Amino acid sequence: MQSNAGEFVDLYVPRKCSASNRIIGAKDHASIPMNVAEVDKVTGRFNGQSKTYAICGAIRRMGESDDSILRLAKSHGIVSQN
Amino acid sequence: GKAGDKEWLPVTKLGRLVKDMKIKSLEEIYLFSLPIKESEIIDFFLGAALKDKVLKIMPVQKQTQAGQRTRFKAFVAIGDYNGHVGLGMKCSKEVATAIRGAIILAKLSIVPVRRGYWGNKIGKPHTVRCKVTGRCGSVLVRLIPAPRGTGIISAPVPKKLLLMAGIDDCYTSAGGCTATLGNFAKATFDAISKTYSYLTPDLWKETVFTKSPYQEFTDHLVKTHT
Amino acid sequence: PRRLFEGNALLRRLVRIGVLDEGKMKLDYILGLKIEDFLERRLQTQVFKLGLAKSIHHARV
Amino acid sequence: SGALDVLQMKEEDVLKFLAAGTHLGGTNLDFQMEQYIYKRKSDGIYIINLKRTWEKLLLAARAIVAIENPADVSVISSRNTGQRAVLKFAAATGATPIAGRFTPGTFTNQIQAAFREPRLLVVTDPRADHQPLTEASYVNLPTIALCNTDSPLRYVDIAIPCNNKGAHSVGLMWWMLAREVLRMRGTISREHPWEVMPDLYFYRDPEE
RNA sequence: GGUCAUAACCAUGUCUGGACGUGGCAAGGGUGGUAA
The missing domain is CATH 3.30.160.20 (Double Stranded RNA Binding Domain)
Known part of the structure; x- marks a missing residue:
């Protein structure tokens, strides 16, 4: 958040989950980032740069996460057709 | 020594x-x-x-x-x-x-807590981001934004909490029993918590994401360390 | 017209007693006013501040 | 996937899946477990597809790789079949096994001499190991598991469908899991057959 | 696939009884004496 002074106020900007486009708390203990490791996709070996996601605790605890992680990954690798 | x-x-x-x-x-x-x-x-x-x-x-x-x-x-x-x-x-x-x-x-x-401005910016926040609530067992508080220099207008019990939060100016409204202060104070505390969980048009810009401190500093967490 | 004419003449009066700067002079800075600035402009305070007294208690007398 | 054939289905493994009866699946469905089933048989059996198994195996495995230090991807199983399997798993790839009765409060406590604090979990059968799953959401652990066709999905980020009512279906699936993580992280990859047997990942079983 | 029975009567209460209030951690010292 930016004032007319140009002072960039607010203690931190909180992360916004890709599960359902909404923002998690600071004591929500069911909200998990999950790092998937990319591979070269020519031999099948680790290659550097991870794809990281984040999911909110609310959709997790009702049990929607299995579809959400699949849908996110389906538009990338290592699922492209299921 | x-x-x-x-x-x-x-x-x-x-x-x-x-x-x-x-x-x-x-x-x-x-x-x-x-x-x-x-x-x-x-x-x-x-x-x-x-x-x-x-x-x-x-x-x-x-x-x-x-x-x-x-x-x-x-x-x-x-x-x-x-x-x-x-x-x-x-x-x-x-x-x-x-x-x-x-x-x-x-x-x-x-x-x-996340603080904001009444409607015009002049640096250094002074009030609550938006009009929020918080209930604990039929006690509730409704923190309503307020312009500068009106002070905290509340009962003595929530006037402690809001003052400690550093929130300068606020208007409040209560509903239900407030003589059972254990509820009353928890309900205030509930209201101030929700401020960062309220989505505003400001926050619609996308967050970059970065690796955990546990992840990056894992090489120091394994040597003999817990 | 109501906002202009009123605001201008309001702020003029706040400047005339000198509890407000003309480096401010916006309606937002009216709200930055507080109790102590008024009390400073009182005569007994200014007697003490700019004339001979030994305490504030002297100056009122 | 997108790799040429080195991250895609192999002719060999199809035979192993079908000999161990993984394709067969229980007589019930959920509203989340109907996106891996194709259809039902003449019989009450509901036939899991193996194409759908294969993709889910991979990105599951790639997440298990992604931790820098593998010594804290804590595997858990309490049913008898998945005991022998997990022990060899956590010997092969660096992990910490928890066999038998969980003893709850493991990650919640601070004072307990069996305290653990992993990052991931890999659980067999959600509705036998419900205690660690519930406890996962108090310490922000991602979660992976093997679902039947009717196991409840809740605190399961990614599933890896399986038959898992016992037999060779259990041990085979843990063996395949350990094959993949070594191809990706290690240098075991050669795309020519791994030495280790799926035989010694199966249940001990009452002996002769 | 598994086997087992008979319930009467029975009301009332002289009574002037209960220690609970604020987070201090915190002595701090040695002339005599084998030698001297």
Whole structure:
């Protein structure tokens, strides 16, 4: 958040989950980032740069996460057709 | 001298990164919404601005065949005026021990508050981001934004909490019983918590994402470390 | 017209007693006013501040 | 996937899946477990597809790789079949096994001499190991498991469908899991057959 | 696939009884004496 002074106020900007486009708390203990490791996709070996996601605790605890992680990954690798 | 000190040895992973000094703000912890379990972590980043304000020391008691048996339950607030506040309740057989038990529990539950402006910016926030609520068992508070210089207009009990939060100007409205202050104070605390969980058009820009402090500093967490 | 004419003449009066700067002079800075600035402009305070007294208690007398 | 054939289905493994009866699946469905089933048989059996198994195996495995230090991807199983399997798993790839009765409060406590604090979990059968799953959401652990066709999905970020009512279906699936993580992280990859048997990942079983 | 029975009567209470209030951690010292 930016004032007319140009002072960039607010203690931190909180992360916004890709599960359902909404923002998690600071004591929500069911909200998990999950790092998937990319591979070269020519031999099948680790290659550097991870794809990281984040999911909110609310959709997790009702049990929607299995579809959400699949849908996110389906538009990338290592699922492209299921 | 002839007397050392030795204070705190962490047995917790999060505690170990702080003691070895790789995490350097509370803001790192909160962004991953990590558990806190040790009350020295919070008192290391802060503890140079934390005050306590013992609200009530209330008796409760159960019944047995030999008569009464009385335990003392006290509520204790905690907060710096920079926007971190917390709250805890605890009970014990004796008074002083219960108070000191509450100052520990209160440190554990500290959270940040998000402050904003009435409608025009001039630097340094002074009020609550938006009109929010919070209910605890049919007590509720409705923190409503207010322009500068109107002070905190509330009952004496929430006037403690909001003042400790550093929120300068506010209007409030209550509903239902408020003479059972254990609910009343928790309901205030509930309301101030929700501020960062309220989505605003400001926050619609996308967050970059970054690897966990646990992840990046894992090479220091494995050598002999917990 | 109501906002302009009123605001201008309001702020003029706040400047005339000198509890407000003309480096401010916006309606937002009206709200930055507080109790102590008024009390400074009182005569007994200014007697003490800019004339001979030994305490504030002297100056009122 | 997108790799040429080195991250895609192999002719060999199809035979192993079908010999161990993984394709067969229980007589019930959920509203989340109907996106891996194709259809039902003449019989009450509901036939899991193996194409759908294969993709889910991979990105599951790639997440298990992604931790820098593998010594804290804590595997858990309490049913008898998945005991022998997990022990060899956590010997092969650096992990910490928890066999038998969980003893709850493992990650919640601070004071307990069996305290653990992993990052991931890999659980067999959600509705036998419900205690660690519930406890996962108090310490922000991602979660992976092997679902039947009717196991409840809740605190399961990614599933890896299986028959898992016992037999060779259990041990085979843990063996395949350990094959993949070594191809990706290690240098066991050669795309020519691994020495280790799926035989010694199966259940001990009452002996002769 | 598994086997077992008979309930009467029974009301009332002289009574002037209960220790609970604020987080102090915190003595801090050695002339005599083998030698001297």
